[PDB]
Amino acid sequence: DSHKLKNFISEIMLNMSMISWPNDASRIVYCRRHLLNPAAQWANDFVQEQGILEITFDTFIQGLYQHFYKPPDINKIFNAITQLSEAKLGIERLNQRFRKIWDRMPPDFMTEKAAIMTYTRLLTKETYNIVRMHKPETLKDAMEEAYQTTALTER
Amino acid sequence: DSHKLKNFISEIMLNMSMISWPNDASRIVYCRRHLLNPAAQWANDFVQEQGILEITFDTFIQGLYQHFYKPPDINKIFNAITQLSEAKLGIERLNQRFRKIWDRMPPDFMTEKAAIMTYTRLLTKETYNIVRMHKPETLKDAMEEAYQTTALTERFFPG
Amino acid sequence: DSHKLKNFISEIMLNMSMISWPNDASRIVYCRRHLLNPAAQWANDFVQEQGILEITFDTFIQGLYQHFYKPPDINKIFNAITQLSEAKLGIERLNQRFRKIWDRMPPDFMTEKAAIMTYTRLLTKETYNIVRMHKPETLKDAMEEAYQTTALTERFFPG
Amino acid sequence: DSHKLKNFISEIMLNMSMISWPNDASRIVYCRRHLLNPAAQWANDFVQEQGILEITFDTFIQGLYQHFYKPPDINKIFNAITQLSEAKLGIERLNQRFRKIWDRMPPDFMTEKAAIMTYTRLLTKETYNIVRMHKPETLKDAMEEAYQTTALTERFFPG
Amino acid sequence: DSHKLKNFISEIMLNMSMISWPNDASRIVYCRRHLLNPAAQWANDFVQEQGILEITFDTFIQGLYQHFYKPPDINKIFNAITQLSEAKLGIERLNQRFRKIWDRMPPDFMTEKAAIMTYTRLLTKETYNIVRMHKPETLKDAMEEAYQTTALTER
Amino acid sequence: DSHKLKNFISEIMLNMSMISWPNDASRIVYCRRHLLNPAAQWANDFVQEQGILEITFDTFIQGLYQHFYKPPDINKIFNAITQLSEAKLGIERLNQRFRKIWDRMPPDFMTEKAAIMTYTRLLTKETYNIVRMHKPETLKDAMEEAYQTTALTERFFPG
Amino acid sequence: DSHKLKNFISEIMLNMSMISWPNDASRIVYCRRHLLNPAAQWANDFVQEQGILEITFDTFIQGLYQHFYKPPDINKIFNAITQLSEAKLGIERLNQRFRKIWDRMPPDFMTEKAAIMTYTRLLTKETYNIVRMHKPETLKDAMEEAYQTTALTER
Amino acid sequence: DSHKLKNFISEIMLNMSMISWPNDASRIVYCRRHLLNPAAQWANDFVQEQGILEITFDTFIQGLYQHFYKPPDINKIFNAITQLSEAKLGIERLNQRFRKIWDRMPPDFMTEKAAIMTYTRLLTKETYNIVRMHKPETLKDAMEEAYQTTALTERFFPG
Amino acid sequence: DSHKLKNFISEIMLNMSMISWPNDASRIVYCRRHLLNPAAQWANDFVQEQGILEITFDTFIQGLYQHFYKPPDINKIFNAITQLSEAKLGIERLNQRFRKIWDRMPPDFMTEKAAIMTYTRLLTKETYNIVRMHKPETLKDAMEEAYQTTALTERFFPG
């Protein structure tokens, strides 16, 4: 439920972002309309609890953030990661599959170098070569590099 | 159908609650739009029956309340509970299946120790052993313990 | 055609009801737009026949009411009722089947005792015994009693 | 026995009513004379049981009321009604048979249209045709019509 | 002879009761006319014995009461009670038969609960069920209940 | 296709008639939206052919009139009518079959008495008797009468 | 592309025609929205080239007319016309087939009498007879007449 | 996919350009609506990745540019060009086939004389003769000349 | 050589840190004394290269930091870790083997929870059970727990 919910919040925030809002009170309330029943129930209670007009949109999202917490299911995520080999047709499958798995469920997981070691080891030895020359600093860069070389002379 | 319907009414009422309504007539009618066919059919007939403009939103919900509710002491839940054995592949099936059945339909059912006795008896004798050492106090803890030991040295994930 | 038409009128009337109308002439005319061809043809003729600006929305609906006065001629319902025997597996089939048939099409049919006599006679002699002790006053009570005794020491559930 | 008995009491009470009685004791006793054996047996015992001169005429009738007037169960009457088909030779059998069954035991049963639907459905399809043209409003009219057409171009007489 | 005689007295008393009597002397004498020979013989002697005009109608009936009352034998009554089973067609036979037997011959017999236990045990197990729900407090109530349920729905 | 099309045009024209139009160009174009594919194809071509802004709504309807003047069909309808005898099981088949055939394809055909003569002659001599007593004035009344007498002392139902 | 484009312009012009426009500038611009990429590219360039607010809707359509009308190959159209005989089942095939071929590609082709001579010669000798009595003045009338007689006693 | 995509971006940008935008946030988002599924998937992820309200419309298009701008595969185009011989039946096949291949994928390729040398060499020696007398200056002229001589004393037509 | 060298630098820096230095020149030079031959050779050259009195102690250590840079080890370490299964006889082999591999080569590697996940997953499912009840917070605790339960109720090897 929680992974979808994290996505849900981002999007809603974006939609709100482009267009102009005339005041904060309207905006905090508007969030409530999209929500699903237990969350919606919670929302009512939270609105009551605050006797003030509101306390900002961000505060309210943080109560939601607080709401959606899984116990750390690190094993499932590790296991998911283990499954991918290079029998997955080319870069594209891997990149999209990895995105879903990785992005969903980390609270802070492992450090930046570690994330690159895990991502990189999985990749064909050839692809590590080009990507090494010159190196990515982040997982998005690694993924963008591998896809770009494959995609450019293909796609 | 009735359990979902009770939830449905609550939510609808909430949605309505936050925002402002300019008059009652609109509001009573708006309820009709969300409803499903037999209920919707009933609704039309009820609207006709009242020759007045309306009689309040609450009245209309009470006709719905009247339409479907479960009586107290519903054996169906016991029977549902009886069906599960350990032929259900591992913890995961049982935990999810039990959640649906148990969570739906109790007004106050039975006490906390009793709920643990019923949940626990169902479980493999082996699993009761580990779970015993050290004990859960609530049904969520029992369920979390059994799943965690199985899941940890096993498992896959969602998304 | 007539049963749908009775529903159609109710709804249309409701839609109209919530929002405000500035004058009657517009409202009577607006009804014509939704209608289907023969009815629509009739409508034109009726509008002509009245040389006055209009005579009220209600009058016009009454001409429609008149156009299809009562949907059943009590026969089909009796016949439907006749069909059920006790070859229908147990209470559950009968209760659900009877609900559909009975609830649909009565304007006022027969009196309360009569409805219980017809419902009760149909039931197995055994079931009448328990139900007699102690008696139902309404068809819903009879149906609830028969189902409850069968269901309690038996049954399964929905969702 | 009970339906006749309820009639019997009413009449007896009426006869008594018009003329003057000089005292209650005579009147209570006089009731006993008309009664039939088991009831009469009961009566003797009841008179003994009351050591006082009497307790009023009404009290004694209430013991009789107690003795047989029970609320009727519609089922026997429905069942009776069910038995007739058109294998009963012509109108005459049906009309007389129906009279006995129907007239005995209704407190208010079912409404007027319903009574005509039940009576009419039973009749041959042909006879419904003539009777329809032009319609009866009451069960006596239906019965009179069916008999009259059959009788007129047929029949014999009593005495 | 005595059981019939007790009935006889009641009736005679009733007949007398409705209509008016102009004086007591006539009334006491009139009783003598209906009576049968030994009793009638006794009556003559009693009338002589009283040198006064009369001593009241009631007194004279009490001499008759005195004449007839003999001690009963409970065993015949018990034995009578024993005979009934449920081979007697339905409630009606039993109720009428029991009335005759029970009502005749008790001076004080047994207590109220006991009388209900004896009456009730005899009845079909089914009938005890309905009658139990809700209970009779007296033998007349038990008898009225059983008859009413049977009677009401049919025959 | 043509009979429905003649109806279609009338209705569309009516709908347009009640409300106000601000200019002719919009109105002529709006007709195109409701139309079905071959007709719609034609419409495009016709719009092109006229280099002027438009030539009136009526002109455009006349091109449609022209399109479905009629194929020879009165004969087909007569022939269709001829086919029914009383070998068709009872009233129900005939009434439904006749409805389809008759209702489809008349622009004005024959007069009201004539329509009753054709309908009535077809019917069994017996049924004409009851229906005569008392007479129908319209084809719907004749059909309703014949069905009602048969249906009442007989019948089953839909859903 | 050009035949469709000629149709496209006509229609667009019609849609515009019925409803009211408050000013010319809006109208000229609105045309651009419906157009497809190369044409759309051209449109941008043309709008720039005119430094004035606009020069009328008609002018802009003429640039489009200019775009599409290239020289047509009259031979192909003649050849197309030659192919039809009376082996085409009845009027309906011919009329529809002729419409497509003729309507597409003429800038001014041949004169009105000539167009009737070409259309008429193609038709069965019988049909020319009825159509002669009384004559059509335009190709649409000829086509309507032939179809109407066939269609009426048929269709 | 990439060639179409480059066109797609240009156009979208143009449409946006003429009319006024009230703020950047709306505009960046609006781009997402037109896009096709994988690209759309990417878009969602990119929007999330930027925690700020947005970073400009242009930035977002650059991520798309990044996604599928392949160098035009000059080799593929050359290779395509190589395949045609004069075994292709006459001018018509060649002209249409060449149009597709050539027109798609050049950013600036080669100069005008070169394009004529490549086009001309491919053609039958005979056809070069007539076309020479008198010469084409552009590829469209060469193509038009060759087709016209063949077509004129030959040919068929479209529609 | 590099791992020891990183340790060496830290320590030297510490020793220097506690006590006071009167000037930077002395301090930079003093570092040279502890160093081993190739590094020492480098040092001389570096001192010459700087014509200024010195550039700070930190700068000089950075040249050393620069000197260490080996190709990355972490892969080898992961691979080493991968090799162990439970085919290694009991706890003792694993614990000692893991100690060597893990302790050597991390600069900061991964976080504390991660290190426990990697250590724990490797262990037999049974051993995770006891160790879970009650949990270790550090890798030394996990290792001590597993060894203690095995060791306590076991025989140890003589040498």
Numbering used by the authors:
A (entry chain F), E (entry chain B), G (entry chain H): 37 to 191
B (entry chain E), C (entry chain D), D (entry chain C), F (entry chain I), H (entry chain G), I (entry chain A): 37 to 195
From the study:
Here, we have determined the structure and molecular architecture of the Ty3 capsid by 3D and 2D cryo-electron microscopy (cryo-EM) and compared it with those of the retroviruses. Formation of the capsid is important for genome protection and is an essential step in the retroelement life cycle. Similar to retroviruses, the protruding capsomers of the Ty3 capsid are formed by the CA-NTD, while the inner layer, linking the capsomers together, is formed by the CA-CTD.
To study the structure of PR- Ty3 particles at higher resolution, we collected a 2D cryo-EM dataset of the purified particles, identified the icosahedral particles by image classification, and determined their structure to 7.5-Å resolution using the RELION single-particle processing pipeline. The particles have a radius to the center of the CA layer of ∼24 nm. The location of pentamers confirmed the T = 9 symmetry identified by cryo-ET and subtomogram averaging. The reconstruction showed clear α-helical densities consistent with the determined resolution, as well as a disordered internal layer, which may correspond to NC and associated nucleic acid. Consistent with the principles of virus architecture described by Caspar and Klug, the T = 9 Ty3 particle capsid is formed from 540 copies of CA. Comparing the nine different non–symmetry-related positions, the fold of the individual CA-NTDs and CA-CTDs does not change, but their relative orientations change. Notably, the trimeric appearance of the sixfold coordinated positions in the EM map is a result of adjacent CA-NTDs existing in two very different orientations [Fig. 3A, orientation A (cyan) and orientation B (dark blue)]. To generate a structural model for the complete PR- Ty3 capsid, we placed the models for the Ty3 CA-NTD and CA-CTD from flexible fitting back into all nine independent positions within the complete EM map and modeled the linker connecting the CA-NTD and the CA-CTD independently for all nine copies using Modeler. To assess the conformational variability of CA within the capsid, we superimposed and compared the nine independent copies of CA, showing large relative movements of the domains about the flexible interdomain linker.
